Amino acid sequence: KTYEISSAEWEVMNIIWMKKYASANNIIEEIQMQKDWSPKTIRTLITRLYKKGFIDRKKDNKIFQYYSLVEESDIKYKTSKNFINKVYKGGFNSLVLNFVEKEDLSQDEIEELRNILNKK
Amino acid sequence: MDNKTYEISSAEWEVMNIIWMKKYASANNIIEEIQMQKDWSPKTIRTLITRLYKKGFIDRKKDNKIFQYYSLVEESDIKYKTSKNFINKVYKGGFNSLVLNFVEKEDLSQDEIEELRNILNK
Numbered sequence: 001k002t003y004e005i006s007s008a009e010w011e012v013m014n015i016i017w018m019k020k021y022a023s024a025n026n027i028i029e030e031i032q033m034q035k036d037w038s039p040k041t042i043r044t045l046i047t048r049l050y051k052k053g054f055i056d057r058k059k060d061n062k063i064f065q066y067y068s069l070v071e072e073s074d075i076k077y078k079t080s081k082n083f084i085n086k087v088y089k090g091g092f093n094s095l096v097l098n099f100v101e102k103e104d105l106s107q108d109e110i111e112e113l114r115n116i117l118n119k120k
Numbered sequence: 121m122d123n124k125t126y127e128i129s130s131a132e133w134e135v136m137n138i139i140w141m142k143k144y145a146s147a148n149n150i151i152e153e154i155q156m157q158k159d160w161s162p163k164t165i166r167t168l169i170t171r172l173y174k175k176g177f178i179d180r181k182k183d184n185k186i187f188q189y190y191s192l193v194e195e196s197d198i199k200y201k202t203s204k205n206f207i208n209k210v211y212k213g214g215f216n217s218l219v220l221n222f223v224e225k226e227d228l229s230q231d232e233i234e235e236l237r238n239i240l241n242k
């Protein structure tokens with residue numbers, strides 16, 4: 001639907017959804033805080049996501065600024081659903097049992113998650 | 121110096137979940153189980169078994185004159201790690217974010233909800 005998307009694309013997309021509008025050079029800067037990717041490798045991620053229809057762009061200055069054409073929450077939920085079907089036999093509850101049985105969740109985190117369920 | 125880290129493809133997960141369910145399974149046991157749900161060939165399936173063996177995820181003992189495959193990886197550990205990477209890739213690292221987006225979007229009757237409450241509290 002909001003179709004396939006690779007690990008490195010998730011990173012570009014995440015920067016865009018958080019910043020709302022971002023230039024190439026912005027994306028390169030943030031990406032490069034945690035990744036040793038060259039500008040060309042990054043610029044090619046922007047190019048594909050633009051071609052695939054995931055993001056678009058306005059020309060503020062003579063400078064292109066990219067923005068999402070995909071709803072963040074929709075593509076993340078769909079992705080999570082493919083993932084849960086792939087790994088955990090199609091059960092979200094299995095995922096949570098696994099996580100909880102294994103992380104040493106702090107009381108604040110426990111409470112937050114309670115607050116999340118209790119919101120209907 | 122630990123062995124090379126690998127990702128597991130969707131079709132490798134189908135194989136590994138059969139291995140974990142059966143504890144010990146031959147190539148023929150796996151082929152048959154897989155074919156019940158999927159139209160993949162014997163060659164295809166043996167290719168997945170071979171890839172997982174080469175990757176270190178599974179090994180084999182010869183009972184009778186027949187290879188029997190078993191996991192080298194604890195199921196809950198590997199699925200947790202896989203979940204953590206996936207949360208770090210998609211959700212900025214917030215498990216809370218994944219749970220949130222999933223409650224905002226599924227239609228959950230409150231008996232789905234409760235077993236989650238009890239996964240928390242218990």
Ligand SMILES: [Cl-]
Pocket residue numbers: 001002003052053054070
């Ligand atoms: Cl699209």
